[PDB]
Amino acid sequence: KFPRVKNWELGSITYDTLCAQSQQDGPCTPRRCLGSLVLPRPAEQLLSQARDFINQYYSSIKRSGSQAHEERLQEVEAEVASTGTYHLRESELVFGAKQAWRNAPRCVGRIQWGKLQVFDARDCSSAQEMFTYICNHIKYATNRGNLRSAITVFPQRAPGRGDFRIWNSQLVRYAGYRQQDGSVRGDPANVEITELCIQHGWTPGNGRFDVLPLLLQAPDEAPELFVLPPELVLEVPLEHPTLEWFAALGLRWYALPAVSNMLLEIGGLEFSAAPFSGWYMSTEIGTRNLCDPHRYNILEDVAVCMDLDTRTTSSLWKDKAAVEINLAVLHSFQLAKVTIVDHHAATVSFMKHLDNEQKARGGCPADWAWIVPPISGSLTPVFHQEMVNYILSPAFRYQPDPW
Amino acid sequence: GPKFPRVKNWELGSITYDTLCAQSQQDGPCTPRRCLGSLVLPRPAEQLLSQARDFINQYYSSIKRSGSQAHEERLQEVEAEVASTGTYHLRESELVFGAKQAWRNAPRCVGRIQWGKLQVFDARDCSSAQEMFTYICNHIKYATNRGNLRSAITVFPQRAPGRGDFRIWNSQLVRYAGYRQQDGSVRGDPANVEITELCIQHGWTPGNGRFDVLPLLLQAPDEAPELFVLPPELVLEVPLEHPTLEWFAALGLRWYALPAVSNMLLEIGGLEFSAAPFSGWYMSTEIGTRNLCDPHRYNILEDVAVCMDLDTRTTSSLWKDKAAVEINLAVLHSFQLAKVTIVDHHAATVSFMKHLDNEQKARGGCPADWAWIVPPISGSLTPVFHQEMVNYILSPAFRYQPDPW
Ligand code: HEM
Ligand code: HEM
Ligand SMILES: CCN(CCc1ccc(NC(=N)c2cccs2)cc1)Cc1cccc(NC(=N)c2cccs2)c1
Ligand SMILES: CCN(CCc1ccc(NC(=N)c2cccs2)cc1)Cc1cccc(NC(=N)c2cccs2)c1
Ligand SMILES: C[C@H](O)[C@H](O)[C@H]1CNc2nc(N)[nH]c(=O)c2N1
Ligand SMILES: C[C@H](O)[C@H](O)[C@H]1CNc2nc(N)[nH]c(=O)c2N1
Ligand SMILES: [Zn+2]
């Protein structure tokens, strides 16, 4: 049955019919809902995903049923039948990557989905070559602060060999040094990748914001270390518009969010290295990366500097310091002329995206827990919006760490 | 290893498995194809008897006499009663256990650390609307307790074959009127426009303030509902002021002390208690964020931001977030000064994490609805944001039921 989806702020109702196109089960059953969980627990097969994807592509260019369309299905069928796999055309890759982004339930920035620079790096044959492509991507996407969404697609997985992989989770990550007494200097999210880099020969620094080298792996070979040229990594020193001491914290963040550990699936084909980037929403830095207790955890230091009463939850010291930290992020990115979006503007644009998608496809897969921001939830319109979560393909998926 | 949902806390890195979810006899709204966890309201003798047996088994376990002669006699008692009457009745101690178990079972409630501390008023002898009113007044007096709030539920007679239901028409025992204006806007609380107009259709003379307490519309079986005005001195309110912003008091904002939900159905062993109002105390974000700042509620964010001299013309000033924080602080400071029990969202969520741990050991899981448990401001500043949760329906339960009109 198609779900009724209600907006509680405005009282309007839509029906999601797009969900009938989901050929892939999520974690929930009628007995229990597992929607808040972060992670999940042959020829005819590939051939049906492939045909379905070819159909999606030709439909998008309005040329369904054409000679072009029928001949491409035969190509795909001939290639699978003989070889057990096939290959996308550049234009199909481009359509498939944009559609994977369109389809991502956890992304609040999908209003932008049509505007994606696609770099084809399927002719890559060494870690060395991956490095060059990654540098060009960083260069293109950063654009001196006028950030532009981009994805670089490396060669697909193949039955008879190891995957191309970027070991780092982002192209830009700060090091995390474990002390002999369990504590962390830097970003505790990155302790494990930091130790991998050292163990593969990297000379470590000892500051709070040391940029990591990349560990890049060509099929069935040990990964290789590649330091990014400092000029390629744009960073933003953080200051506050009115609190002078805030700059004295020595806080900074990188401009470019570039996810490099997800698998891109198109038409049954899987791209194990396909790093993508856009721009940040301020709460990702301001709230999560700087205030999570298991991240940089700076809320207490900011509260002391602000002279808040830290001894009781009911002074709302956490809330006040978080807000100022998020304001600092926005102010500093704006001063540095680096693209960023606040959570109000971002969620307003997502509401427009939902409406666009309702008209265009009869629904939009969205994961409420990830779309609603991590401060000021009900102050944004997405909090009051019901949403339906399901897996469409093309898709960005999680995959195992390669070590 | 374990064939049960794996539940992770991403802050602490710890893992549990929910085995309680196996005791669920009732489907939620989700399927393998699509998750509907974010939807607010997604859409016979042997049936009764099996619900009844299960509940009686739950009761006897709770007092550690599973399989005893007292247990097998009670089962026989219940089937005999259903056999001859089509229904059955709860012993007093069974009603008490079942009302606490329903609270304990409520996936949307963050206050469940307190579940064992509930005063159960048994009003199953009530036979008129006038008498419901007396019971409700007594409930309010007990629960309010001059500011030192005490959790309580009052249980009216269960649904009976043919005979009409006891119903309270109001969604809460205390609600502010919402008066639709000529210009199409609302004075008072827009959530209550419908109950306000029903009160007027039923003979209430309306006021015209922003905070007029509504009368109760109480319905006894097969009768038109009757109207009762709460004695003003029974409805404790808290005027709002801010600890440092001296002008906030000039806004004339207020909220009532006692949140008492009155339109939910309490189901125990298949029995249906259609009138069963319950009350605890507020978490401060219900007032300061949702009630006062929702755009479809009092919607005061812009007014407060203007008094704070914020830049309301641009989202990136964070004017909304700063105003909301101060409004929340005013709510906490004002309740505190008035000595009325309230809990802030940090203290509530921390205590809910303790609840989760207690329930892991006691029952092997805790049904919880993440979207409702995470507070509406400062989500990820609370420990519940980082905690995975498995949502499912256990019984006894508090359920939604259609409006009586
Ligand atoms: C253009 C600006 C964009 C903004 C502001 C944005 C915003 C976000 C945010 C805030 C998240 C949640 C991230 C987190 O909590 O860690 C996210 C998730 C995601 N976005 Fe975007 N997005 C943008 C562009 C893109 C692009 C270009 C892609 C891919 C081509 C993409 C795909 C994703 C995916 C796959 C996720 C989910 C990651 C996961 O499940 O762990 N987004 N987006
Ligand atoms: C002891 C103090 C308590 C606190 C701080 C508290 C907190 C809350 C909060 C914040 C909500 C969400 C309300 C909303 O967003 O509108 C809630 C929901 C709920 N609580 Fe409590 N709770 C308390 C006691 C109780 C008691 C005594 C009961 C019943 C015996 C109860 C049963 C419920 C139920 C059934 C819901 C779900 C409402 C719905 O789905 O519409 N809680 N609780
Ligand atoms: C895949 C990693 N995401 C973050 C991805 C991400 C997506 C988007 C952004 N932000 C952006 N604005 C953009 C990035 C790229 C385009 S826009 C930032 C990060 C978080 C995540 C999801 C699921 C599981 C995990 N896993 C973990 N946290 C683990 C730690 C140790 C073992 S597993 C992490
Ligand atoms: C049943 C009403 N709940 C809120 C109940 C509630 C529970 C708890 C509290 N707060 C408390 N702290 C307590 C109250 C009692 C004990 S603790 C306040 C309110 C909200 C809700 C949920 C689902 C649907 C609706 N209904 C609707 N909004 C509508 C339907 C049709 C038109 S409007 C309302
Ligand atoms: C347990 C819970 O699902 C988890 O903390 C989620 C909640 N919402 C999120 N939302 C976003 N955007 N990013 C996240 O990492 C998370 N974490
Ligand atoms: C659409 C969404 O489910 C809805 O706005 C929910 C979200 N979480 C909530 N959480 C609580 N505690 N109370 C609510 O009314 C809601 N509303
Ligand atoms: Zn679900």
Side-chain angles (χ1 to χ4, degrees), chain A residues 41 129 188 240 261 315:
Chain A
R41 189 74 140 89
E129 294 181 340
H240 185 275
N261 61 177
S315 67

Side-chain angles (χ1 to χ4, degrees), chain A residues 98-228:
Chain A
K98 296 181 178 166
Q99 208 64 24
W101 176 20
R102 193 187 193 178
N103 287 341
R106 288 172 170 185
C107 170
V108 76
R110 292 173 277 162
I111 192 92
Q112 284 295 137
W113 75 265
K115 201 166 204 295
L116 178 68
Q117 180 56 37
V118 177
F119 300 114
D120 181 0
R122 288 170 302 160
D123 62 343
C124 188
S125 74
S126 68
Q128 245 303 323
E129 294 181 340
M130 303 179 62
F131 188 52
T132 305
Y133 279 109
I134 280 155
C135 278
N136 289 338
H137 177 125
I138 291 167
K139 163 270 170 216
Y140 174 89
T142 302
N143 189 208
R144 298 150 68 243
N146 188 187
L147 273 33
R148 307 182 271 200
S149 305
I151 183 173
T152 289
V153 183
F154 295 103
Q156 66 204 53
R157 336 236 275 109
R161 60 117 168 102
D163 293 344
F164 286 85
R165 292 293 308 261
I166 298 155
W167 280 33
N168 305 54
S169 67
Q170 293 191 23
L171 299 179
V172 193
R173 290 272 72 190
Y174 298 126
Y177 305 107
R178 190 139 55 196
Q179 307 304 311
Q180 52 193 38
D181 48 286
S183 70
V184 176
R185 186 153 178 88
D187 185 351
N190 305 327
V191 168
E192 199 181 25
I193 185 59
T194 299
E195 278 154 354
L196 286 164
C197 285
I198 300 178
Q199 171 202 130
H200 281 91
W202 182 52
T203 296
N206 72 286
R208 283 187 86 189
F209 302 103
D210 300 343
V211 181
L212 287 160
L214 306 164
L215 283 162
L216 296 183
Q217 179 175 34
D220 300 309
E221 293 285 21
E224 287 161 41
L225 205 66
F226 297 93
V227 177
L228 291 151

Side-chain angles (χ1 to χ4, degrees), chain A residues 8 368 383-386, chain B residues 38 40 290 371-372:
Chain A
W8 288 86
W368 193 92
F383 182 96
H384 310 279
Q385 176 67 55
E386 287 177 358
Chain B
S38 88
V40 166
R290 299 303 308 287
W372 277 67

Side-chain angles (χ1 to χ4, degrees), chain B residues 114-379:
Chain B
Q114 288 291 150
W115 73 268
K117 186 169 174 179
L118 183 64
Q119 182 53 30
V120 179
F121 297 110
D122 190 338
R124 283 179 305 161
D125 62 358
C126 193
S127 56
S128 80
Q130 180 66 69
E131 189 179 9
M132 306 169 63
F133 183 56
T134 305
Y135 274 115
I136 283 154
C137 279
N138 289 342
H139 179 134
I140 291 165
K141 292 200 280 241
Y142 182 85
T144 303
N145 184 38
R146 320 218 335 273
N148 189 16
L149 277 42
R150 303 179 288 209
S151 298
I153 181 165
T154 294
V155 185
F156 292 105
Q158 70 202 45
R159 173 169 297 101
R163 193 262 272 150
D165 292 333
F166 288 80
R167 289 297 291 269
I168 298 150
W169 282 32
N170 308 60
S171 71
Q172 292 190 27
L173 306 181
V174 192
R175 300 266 64 202
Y176 297 124
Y179 307 109
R180 190 146 281 297
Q181 306 294 284
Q182 284 145 287
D183 58 30
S185 66
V186 173
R187 189 181 288 163
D189 191 344
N192 304 322
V193 162
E194 183 173 25
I195 189 61
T196 303
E197 282 165 18
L198 277 166
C199 284
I200 303 165
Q201 287 159 20
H202 281 100
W204 182 55
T205 295
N208 72 332
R210 297 191 85 183
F211 299 104
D212 299 337
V213 174
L214 282 160
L216 272 16
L217 231 11
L218 304 181
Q219 176 167 57
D222 297 303
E223 279 190 347
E226 297 167 43
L227 199 57
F228 296 92
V229 178
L230 294 163
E233 66 273 14
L234 264 51
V235 178
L236 180 63
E237 293 177 281
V238 176
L240 302 183
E241 53 186 286
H242 190 272
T244 51
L245 296 170
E246 298 185 68
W247 49 256
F248 193 105
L251 262 16
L253 301 170
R254 62 212 276 107
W255 207 264
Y256 51 88
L258 186 79
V261 174
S262 53
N263 61 176
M264 288 182 98
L265 186 142
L266 166 62
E267 178 264 323
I268 298 164
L271 304 181
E272 297 180 298
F273 299 89
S274 57
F278 58 87
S279 66
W281 53 79
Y282 268 120
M283 172 166 85
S284 60
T285 59
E286 305 176 69
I287 309 178
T289 310
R290 299 303 308 287
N291 300 353
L292 294 178
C293 312
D294 276 355
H296 53 298
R297 295 294 296 287
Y298 281 83
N299 193 207
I300 70 181
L301 233 29
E302 192 180 19
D303 298 326
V304 167
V306 165
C307 303
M308 296 179 60
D309 200 47
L310 301 179
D311 190 354
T312 56
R313 307 166 316 199
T314 176
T315 56
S316 60
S317 70
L318 307 191
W319 64 270
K320 289 179 179 188
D321 313 67
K322 296 171 142 181
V325 160
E326 292 322 323
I327 294 156
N328 279 268
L329 183 59
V331 173
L332 286 158
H333 161 73
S334 303
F335 272 65
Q336 286 164 187
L337 188 74
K339 305 314 168 206
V340 176
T341 309
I342 186 156
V343 65
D344 73 64
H345 50 286
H346 303 287
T349 53
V350 164
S351 80
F352 184 70
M353 296 297 298
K354 172 56 163 193
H355 179 66
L356 293 177
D357 190 63
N358 292 347
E359 293 287 83
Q360 190 62 34
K361 301 186 280 142
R363 295 216 281 185
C366 175
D369 185 329
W370 189 98
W372 277 67
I373 296 297
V374 173
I377 49 162
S378 308

Side-chain angles (χ1 to χ4, degrees), chain A residues 26-27 32 34 37-41, chain B residues 1-7 15-17:
Chain A
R32 81 291 180 286
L34 260 29
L37 298 238
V38 172
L39 296 183
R41 189 74 140 89
Chain B
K3 293 166 275 268
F4 299 95
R6 186 191 222 247
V7 186
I15 287 302
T16 63
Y17 294 89

Side-chain angles (χ1 to χ4, degrees), chain A residues 1-6 8-10 15 19-39 41 240 282 287-288 291-294 299 312-320 322-328 330-331 334 342-345 348 366 368-370 372-379 381 383-391, chain B residues 1-8 10-12 17 21-43 242 244 284 289-290 293-296 301 314-322 324-326 328-329 332-333 336 344-347 368 370-372 374-381 385-393:
Chain A
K1 212 97 135 74
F2 314 87
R4 183 186 154 277
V5 177
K6 193 187 173 163
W8 288 86
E9 173 186 351
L10 310 170
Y15 295 93
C19 66
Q21 309 303 304
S22 183
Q23 325 262 36
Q24 247 277 324
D25 292 354
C28 305
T29 67
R31 137 164 289 111
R32 81 291 180 286
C33 163
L34 260 29
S36 76
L37 298 238
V38 172
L39 296 183
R41 189 74 140 89
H240 185 275
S282 55
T287 302
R288 304 305 307 284
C291 316
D292 276 3
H294 56 298
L299 233 25
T312 173
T313 53
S314 62
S315 67
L316 302 190
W317 71 264
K318 294 188 150 151
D319 309 74
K320 290 175 163 178
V323 161
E324 298 310 336
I325 300 160
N326 290 78
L327 194 56
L330 279 162
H331 170 76
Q334 282 154 17
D342 72 65
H343 54 292
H344 302 292
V348 160
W368 193 92
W370 280 62
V372 167
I375 51 167
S376 304
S378 74
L379 274 30
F383 182 96
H384 310 279
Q385 176 67 55
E386 287 177 358
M387 295 175 196
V388 184
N389 197 359
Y390 45 92
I391 301 152
Chain B
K3 293 166 275 268
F4 299 95
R6 186 191 222 247
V7 186
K8 179 155 176 182
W10 289 86
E11 175 189 345
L12 304 168
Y17 294 89
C21 64
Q23 302 316 284
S24 184
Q25 322 260 135
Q26 183 147 57
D27 300 350
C30 302
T31 65
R33 246 206 202 83
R34 84 295 177 281
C35 174
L36 264 31
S38 88
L39 298 238
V40 166
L41 297 162
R43 208 75 88 255
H242 190 272
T244 51
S284 60
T289 310
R290 299 303 308 287
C293 312
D294 276 355
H296 53 298
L301 233 29
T314 176
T315 56
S316 60
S317 70
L318 307 191
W319 64 270
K320 289 179 179 188
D321 313 67
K322 296 171 142 181
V325 160
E326 292 322 323
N328 279 268
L329 183 59
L332 286 158
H333 161 73
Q336 286 164 187
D344 73 64
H345 50 286
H346 303 287
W370 189 98
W372 277 67
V374 173
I377 49 162
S378 308
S380 68
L381 278 23
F385 183 99
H386 311 284
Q387 174 60 61
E388 291 173 350
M389 293 173 199
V390 183
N391 188 186
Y392 45 99
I393 298 162

